[PDB]
């Protein structure tokens, strides 16, 4: 009941609550609107770093 496990993801995935919390935290942390973040995450556009 208390012991847990872990899934090793080969691709790191960002949390959903930091995107659709209205407002989002990453949206205010990156100074970027939620639309650009959603279009980048869902594999439609790129963004420089």
């Amino acid at each position: 009941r208390e012991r847990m496990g872990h899934i090793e993801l080969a691709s790191p995935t960002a949390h959903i609550w930091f995107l659709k919390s209205l407002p989002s935290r990453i949206g205010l942390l990156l100074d970027m609107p939620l639309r650009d973040i959603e279009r980048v995450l869902y594999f439609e556009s790129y963004v420089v770093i």
């Binding site: 009941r1 208390e2 012991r3 847990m4 899934i7 993801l9 080969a10 691709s11 995935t13 949390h15 959903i16 609550w17 995450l41 869902y42 594999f43």
Partner: protein, 586 residues
């Protein structure tokens, strides 16, 4: 962990599955396909679609909320994820920490117990045996009867005679916790000493129900046990019924007597002008009770009696003075219940609801609380006894109809007829016609109600060394209404006299009242208008209980964030209290 998503093998082809496991399987499938795809050097579009599917599965299992797309069988709402399992009315923060199920409890209907004291309540035999199994087990292990726990279980299931005294021992001073289904304030949960009663229902003290607002139309109350020395002593100290007499909102006692006892005491105190034993003399309350039990004198008769009243001085002294009063036999008999603290003028009245309420208030303020509970218990006992011995009963002839009621109705009809004639002639309009008929009908209703009221407080005459002497009406319905037991003035007014004006679907007043009363046959359209007006009033309660519950919820949400911890701060700021004299006088 798998325990929080259990998969028990259900009987038959049907299986008890958890939905989170489907999302887990989906995300594991997508993760495995991603791990296998990136090793064969797949091009960009396939691995990108795979990563997109993995991210979609992740953001779906974390929370199942979309714009308008929801996958589910027939509930018209999608499957609950862990986030949805945390939120909602059925979520963790509302279903598994706020309200939880507790064991060692019971639920049964309530029944009136008039013999039990205020500090105790009834409890069924089977419920008592079920709610105290380990106490009986431990007491049997303490004695040389039950060797093992299985032996004690076989004994208590065998239902022999040597287990009943053990129950009486373990329920001698072990208070239980009674609870009403809706708990508006703290009084919805109290503590009571249980007494074994034979049957299958929970016997409750009659007076304490007012604290729960629990009628006896089939209310199902719950019962719990402390099961802890600390909890037992707490229930005996604070949550006990005797320790809670004053309402948390107002300093007025929640121990106000009910309708039966106040009716009995009003009958015992209401005196006529001529009866058996009129104008005689007695030497004390005990001799008066003996004279009443022998039947030589009536219950109520103006008799000069001698009593001894105790008055409290500035210190804790109680000076006794013997005085000859001129009161009725009922008050002198009831004086045996009043302790020495209260004076005699507190009972030299008709003892209405407010009268006995202020009597209990003064008794608690003067003598404290220790004798106040016994005083109230004896009040209820004597009230029930003398109400049973009286024989109060409402009949079809007890409600007198005014003689000139028909004449008043005819006058109002002639007035409305001439008003309608003036309206048809073109002198007055329709709005002024309505405004002039409403007040006419209101005045007629007021006149007929005053006539009925003065006709109810009369007709009770009897020869008292003379020919005719008017006195307080001994009528049953008047004794029930004027005493404030159950009926009010408006209720008896609309019952005996005309009901008056009614409402309309818009909410305003219809220009035609109900010229009939309950004692007479109501026309079908009159009853239709009345039930139309009453259905709204009935539905308000059902549509308001949930709003009041939600309001109480919000109020306790904003509240319960503080406790008193400091004795004094050393400030001087405050508010300037003044009586509210705005509008009217005060």
């Amino acid at each position: 962990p798998p325990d929080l998503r259990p998969l028990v093998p259900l009987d038959g082809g049907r299986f008890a599955t958890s939905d989170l496991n489907d999302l887990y399987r989906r995300v594991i499938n997508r993760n495995n396909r991603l791990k296998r795809l990136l090793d064969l050097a797949a091009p960009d579009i396939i691995v990108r679609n795979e990563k997109r599917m993995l991210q979609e599965a992740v953001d779906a299992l974390l929370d199942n909320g979309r714009r308008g797309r929801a996958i589910t069988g027939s509930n018209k709402r999608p499957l609950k994820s862990l986030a949805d399992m945390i939120k909602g009315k059925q979520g963790r923060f509302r279903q598994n920490l706020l309200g939880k199920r507790v064991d060692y409890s019971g639920r049964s209907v309530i029944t009136v117990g008039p013999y039990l004291r205020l500090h105790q309540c009834g409890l069924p035999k089977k419920m008592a045996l079920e709610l105290f199994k380990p106490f009986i087990y431990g007491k049997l292990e303490l004695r040389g009867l039950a060797t093992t726990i299985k032996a004690a279980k076989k004994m208590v299931e065998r239902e022999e005679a040597v287990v009943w005294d053990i129950l009486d021992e373990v329920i001698r001073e072990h208070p239980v916790l009674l609870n009403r289904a809706p708990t508006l304030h703290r009084l919805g949960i109290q503590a009571f000493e249980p007494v074994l009663i034979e049957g299958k229902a929970i016997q409750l003290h009659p007076l304490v129900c007012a604290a729960y607002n629990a009628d006896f139309d089939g209310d199902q109350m719950a019962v719990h046990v402390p099961l802890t020395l600390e909890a037992q002593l707490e229930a005996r100290a604070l949550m006990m019924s005797t320790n809670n007499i004053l309402s948390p909102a107002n300093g007025e006692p929640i121990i106000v007597p009910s309708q039966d006892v106040v009716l009995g005491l009003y009958y015992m105190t209401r005196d006529c002008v001529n009866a058996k034993g009129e104008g005689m003399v007695l030497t004390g309350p005990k001799e008066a009770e003996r004279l009443y039990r022998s039947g030589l004198a009536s219950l109520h008769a103006r008799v000069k009696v001698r009593i001894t009243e105790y008055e409290k001085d500035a210190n804790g002294e109680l000076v006794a003075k013997t005085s000859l009063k001129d009161t009725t036999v009922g008050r002198a008999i009831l004086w045996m219940i009043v302790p020495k603290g209260l004076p005699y003028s507190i009972v030299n009245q008709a003892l209405g609801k407010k009268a006995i309420s202020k009597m209990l208030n003064t008794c608690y303020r003067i003598l404290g609380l220790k004798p106040t509970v016994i005083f109230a218990d004896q009040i209820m006992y004597t009230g029930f006894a003398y109400a049973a011995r009286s024989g109060a009963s409402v009949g079809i002839d007890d409600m007198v109809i005014p003689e000139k009621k028909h004449e008043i109705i005819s006058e109002a009809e002639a007035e409305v007829a001439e008003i309608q004639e003036q309206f048809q002639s073109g002198l007055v309009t329709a709005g002024e016609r309505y405004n002039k008929v409403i007040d006419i009908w209101a005045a007629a209703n007021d006149r007929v109600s005053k006539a009925m009221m003065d006709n109810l407080q009369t007709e009770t005459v009897i020869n008292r060394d003379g020919q005719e002497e008017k006195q307080v009406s001994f009528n049953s319905i008047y004794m029930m209404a004027d005493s404030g037991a159950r009926g009010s003035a408006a209720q008896i007014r609309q019952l005996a006299g005309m009901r008056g004006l009614m409402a309309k679907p818009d909410g305003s007043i219809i220009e035609t009242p109900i010229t009939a009363n309950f004692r007479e046959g109501l026309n079908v359209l009159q009853y239709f208008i009345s039930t139309h007006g009453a259905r709204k009033g009935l539905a308000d309660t059902a549509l308001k209980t949930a709003n009041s519950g939600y309001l109480t919820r919000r109020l306790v949400d904003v509240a319960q964030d503080l406790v008193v911890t400091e004795d004094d701060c050393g400030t001087h700021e405050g508010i300037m209290m003044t009586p509210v004299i705005e509008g009217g006088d005060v």
